[model samples]
Target: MTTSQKHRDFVAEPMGEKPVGSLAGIGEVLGKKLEERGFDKAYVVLGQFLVLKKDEDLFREWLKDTCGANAKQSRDCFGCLREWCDAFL
Candidate 1:
């Protein structure tokens, strides 16, 4: 899937009942890993980002370690949340 498409969809609306799988760069493999750790929903993942006080570096490191997200993957996720928060919350 195109990362741009995923990011656009995810940012265009509030993540009411979306899953971690819906996030850009977080496909089946990373989504499975995220769910295994109880972050089954997109809100939980974003909540964690909020809890980190929007610390991009820290959040990206956590995403990298938790879901083994690579540089581009982490960048996609971080940007997704960052923009979502800017527009929504």
Candidate 2:
């Protein structure tokens, strides 16, 4: 399985207090968008992932709507959160 440094870094820790940009798909632009919408933290997004029952489609759509994440970006974020859940939830 291929993983970016961001993915590895994110999943390696508790994700506490990390900026939204710490998430794999959330770069500067998307992170700013997320922050503007009150999802400035990684945990905020994780909470949404959990609230969505970890449903890939739901989470992906939410990511898209929340920050204009494209398909690939949403997928990366979803996968990152899903793996985080598997490891720590």
The best candidate in terms of lDDT: 1
lDDT of 2: 0.84
TM-score of each: 0.91, 0.91
**Model 2 spans with C-alpha error above 4 angstroms:** none
Flag regions of model 1 displaced more than 4 Å.
none
Q: Would you give me the overall lDDT of model 1?
A: 0.86
Please write out the lDDT profile of model 1 over residues 26-57, one tens digit for every residue.
Answer: 88988999999999898888889999998989
lDDT of 2 at 38: 91
